[PDB]
Amino acid sequence: NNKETGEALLTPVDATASSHDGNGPDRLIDQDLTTRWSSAGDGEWAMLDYGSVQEFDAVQASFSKGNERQSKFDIQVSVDGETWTTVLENQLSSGKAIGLERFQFEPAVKARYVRYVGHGNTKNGWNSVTGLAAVNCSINACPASQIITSDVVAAEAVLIAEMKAAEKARKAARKDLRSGNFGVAAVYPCETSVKCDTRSALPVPTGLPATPVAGNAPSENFDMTHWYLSQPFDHDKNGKPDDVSEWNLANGYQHPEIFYTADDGGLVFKSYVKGVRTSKNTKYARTELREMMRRGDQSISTKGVNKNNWVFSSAPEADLEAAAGIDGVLEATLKIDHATTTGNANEVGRFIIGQIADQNDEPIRLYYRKLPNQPTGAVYFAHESQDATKEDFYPLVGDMTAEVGEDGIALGEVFSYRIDVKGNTMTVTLMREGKDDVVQVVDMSNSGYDVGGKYMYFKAGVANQNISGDLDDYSQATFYQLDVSHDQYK
Ligand SMILES: O=C(O)[C@@H]1O[C@@H](O[C@H]2[C@H](O)[C@H](O)[C@H](O[C@H]3[C@H](O)[C@H](O)[C@H](O[C@H]4[C@H](O)[C@H](O)[C@H](O[C@H]5[C@H](O)[C@H](O)[C@H](O[C@H]6[C@H](O)[C@H](O)[C@H](O[C@H]7[C@H](O)[C@H](O)[C@H](O[C@H]8[C@H](O)[C@H](O)[C@H](O[C@H]9[C@H](O)[C@H](O)[C@H](O)O[C@H]9C(=O)O)O[C@H]8C(=O)O)O[C@H]7C(=O)O)O[C@H]6C(=O)O)O[C@H]5C(=O)O)O[C@H]4C(=O)O)O[C@H]3C(=O)O)O[C@H]2C(=O)O)[C@@H](O)[C@@H](O)[C@@H]1O
């Protein structure tokens, strides 16, 4: 009954979404395979509004990276846009095509609103769709080619090649930003002024002022014995960030461009778009601290369930004991001085200010994000779970669209955060003077961070999440508190 021919599809009057990352729902109906609506988390939806009641019996949808993974979804319809009928369930896209694919049901239904309800894909927890449309196969083309068969794949070959040549060019443009050949020359206390005993633990700093003081080195305002600093320039030309070890940081290290005490005592981190990066697994530069519970004793390794890292108290007994501590609290107070104003729809204005990471994934990445056109910014966080097959975002002040108007956190405004892990429960709190705390509690029982062999460390500072803006654009934050604690086994 399906024909190769038919009249034009209806144009939706409105496309909306429960959420997105800046790649908004307007990108579903633009017929461009080069744009996408993206959102993360089971049950997130995009909705086509047709303006009045119409008749449909199918949808056509093209999928972001549709040839590398399969998306999972339902489709639902409504007359009122309050009561929802499910017409297609546990659909799985083909994984073989980036062009349109049809998902058809019998019989037709009457609806004004049609909704895509996403359940991630087979690789990660993202719902990412390049085109969606409700279709009536009595009047509209429902061609054969939208059923993905070997010959549809062969027919995609020219499109695939052109996409890949554009990927390749962007990858080359990104590579040009990564020389690390910039910034004034660093001065390392361990090479210049201090004999550093890298086979011992640093002393515990005492007499740290309650409020950071201008003209103090960061290690005089904060306990810098349990961090190393990742710096985005590469002055010894090994292709890697020039890292500042705990013995250096704890003896007064500062870099006057990117890591230094401000004129009110705050610790400033600045991160440009440009720089070398920590590995091929990220696209982004960072100017960020990485927790080192060995605290300067370099006989202990950086990586491993060992005396440099902690574990959740819900981990197996062997891990609980082999770790330097169990559970953890990071508490920080800071203000954002500047957010990138250039870059693409999901990256502009976005960076990370706190993390907990294991070898591969992040139990949390705390973002701040300000859009160049909004007068305040958003703070929200991600919990990645189940070996990175799942990802959920939780708002704190606004959400990942960062469309907060006047209601978010302004450049210059001081606020606090707390990341608190006790076993398989993470509590994240956002504090602001004269306002109520905002709290999100994350149940991690099924997150798989207690399975055994996973080691944890905190991070704080500014990890850029923008590789697409101008090379010299930057994001910058000033911290006034950085307090880390852990429990001990028995
Ligand atoms: O539809 C869609 O799908 C679309 O998706 C959406 O996009 C989102 C998706 O999620 C998407 O997947 C993507 O996600 C990516 C994002 O990037 C995201 O933020 C996230 O990023 C994470 C990842 O984890 C990522 O991998 C990276 O991790 C960082 C991590 O933060 C840490 O930095 C960590 O650091 C490591 C690392 O190896 C690093 O290089 C470094 O190694 C150093 C260091 O100095 C160590 O101390 C150690 O030192 C040793 C050395 O040998 C040293 O020389 C010395 O040696 C000693 C020693 O004794 C020796 O043996 C010898 O005798 O000599 C001595 C001497 O010489 O001194 O000391 C040693 C020692 O052990 O002490 O190792 C060195 C070294 O160089 O090896 O530090 C380690 C460390 O652990 O500290 O890892 C890095 C890393 O890169 O791995 O970033 C994070 C992050 O910041 O977030 O995940 C990404 C992903 O791809 O999964 O993007 C998302 C978004 O964009 O949002 C949307 O696009 C949507 O629109 C679409 O729909």
Is the CB of 365 within 6 Å of ligand 1? yes
Quote the CA–CA distance of 228 and 286 in Å, as a whole number. Answer: 13
Domain 175-487, CATH number (from 3.20.20.70, 1.25.40.10, 3.40.1000.10, 2.60.120.200): 2.60.120.200
- Residue 225 tokens read as 């014995």
Quote the CA–CA distance of 267 and 249 in Å, as a whole number. Answer: 12
Is the CB of 303 within 6 Å of ligand 1? yes
Is the CB of 198 within 6 Å of ligand 1? no
- What is the C-alpha radius of gyration for the chain, rounded to an integer number of angstroms? 25
Distances, alpha carbon 45 to alpha carbons 124, 381, 387, 437, 456, in Å: 17, 19, 24, 29, 33
Task: Give the residue ranges of DSSP H helices in 23-83.
Answer: none
User: In what helix (H) or strand (E) does residue 81 lie, and over which residues does it extend?
Assistant: none
- The bridge status of strand 310-311 relative to strand 325-338 is parallel
| CB count in 10 Å sphere of residue 463 | 25
Tell me which residue has tokens 């090994």: 238
Contact 340, 273 (CB under 8 A): yes
Contact 303, 284 (CB under 8 A): no
Is the CB of 245 within 6 Å of ligand 1? no
Quote the CA–CA distance of 182 and 160 in Å, as a whole number. Answer: 37
Q: How far does Cα 287 stand from its chain's mean position?
A: 16
| Ligand 1 atom 3: residue of nearest CA | 126
- What is the DSSP code string of 27-40? GGSS--TT--EEEE
- The bridge status of strand 325-338 relative to strand 45-63 is unpaired
| CB count in 10 Å sphere of residue 167 | 10
Which class for 119: exposed (0-12), middle (13-18), buried (19 or more C-beta within 10 A)?
A: middle
- The bridge status of strand 101-121 relative to strand 45-63 is antiparallel
Is the CB of 308 within 6 Å of ligand 1? no
Quote the CA–CA distance of 14 and 24 in Å, as a whole number. Answer: 12
Contact 82, 58 (CB under 8 A): no
**Residue of 73, 15, 56 whose CA lies nearest to 140:** 56
Report the separation in Å between the CA atom of 369 and the middle of ligand 1, taken as the mean of its atom positions. 21
Residues whose CB is less than 8 angstroms from the CB of residue 96 and which lie 6 or more positions away in sequence, other chains included? 66, 67, 148, 152, 153
Report the separation in Å between the CA atom of 389 and the middle of ligand 1, taken as the mean of its atom positions. 18
Contact 456, 245 (CB under 8 A): no
Report the separation in Å between the CA atom of 333 and the middle of ligand 1, taken as the mean of its atom positions. 25
**Residue of 402, 254, 248 whose CA lies nearest to 340:** 402
| Ligand 1 atom 31: residue of nearest CA | 357
**Residue of 251, 105, 260 whose CA lies nearest to 188:** 251
Contact 322, 305 (CB under 8 A): yes
DSSP state of 456: B
**Residue of 312, 357, 356 whose CA lies nearest to 489:** 312
Quote the CA–CA distance of 335 and 415 in Å, as a whole number. Answer: 6
Residue 41 φ/ψ region, left for φ over 0, alpha for ψ in the -120 to 50 degree band, beta for the rest: left
Quote the CA–CA distance of 251 and 267 in Å, as a whole number. Answer: 15
Tell me which residue has tokens 């060995």: 294
Is the CB of 64 within 6 Å of ligand 1? yes
- Residue 106 tokens read as 């019998």
Contact 212, 223 (CB under 8 A): no
Tell me which residue has tokens 């911290």: 479
- What is the DSSP code string of 131-189? EEEEE-TTTB---GGGS--HHHHHHHHHHHHHHHHHHHHHHHHHHTT-----SPPP--H
Quote the CA–CA distance of 352 and 279 in Å, as a whole number. Answer: 17
> Of all atoms in ligand 1, which is nearest to the CA of residue 290?
83
Q: Dihedral through CA 276, CA 402, CA 63, CA 125, nearest 10?
A: 80
Quote the CA–CA distance of 117 and 53 in Å, as a whole number. Answer: 20
Quote the CA–CA distance of 315 and 292 in Å, as a whole number. Answer: 20
Quote the CA–CA distance of 61 and 94 in Å, as a whole number. Answer: 11
- Phi then psi dihedrals of residue 155, to 5 deg: -65, -25
Quote the CA–CA distance of 445 and 29 in Å, as a whole number. Answer: 39
Output the CA angle 243-246-249, nearest 5 degrees.
80
Report the separation in Å between the CA atom of 279 and the middle of ligand 1, taken as the mean of its atom positions. 5
Preceding amide of 107 cis, omega within 30: yes
Contact 275, 241 (CB under 8 A): yes
Report the separation in Å between the CA atom of 360 and the middle of ligand 1, taken as the mean of its atom positions. 8
Contact 450, 312 (CB under 8 A): yes
Distances, alpha carbon 446 to alpha carbons 308, 356, 429, 431, 454, in Å: 26, 17, 22, 28, 15
- The bridge status of strand 415-422 relative to strand 325-338 is antiparallel
Contact 110, 79 (CB under 8 A): yes
Residues β-bridged to residue 478: 268, 335
| Ligand 1 atom 84: residue of nearest CA | 278
Quote the CA–CA distance of 116 and 39 in Å, as a whole number. Answer: 11
Report the separation in Å between the CA atom of 361 and the middle of ligand 1, taken as the mean of its atom positions. 10
User: In what helix (H) or strand (E) does residue 324 lie, and over which residues does it extend?
Assistant: none
| Ligand 1 atom 93: residue of nearest CA | 365
Is the CB of 463 within 6 Å of ligand 1? yes
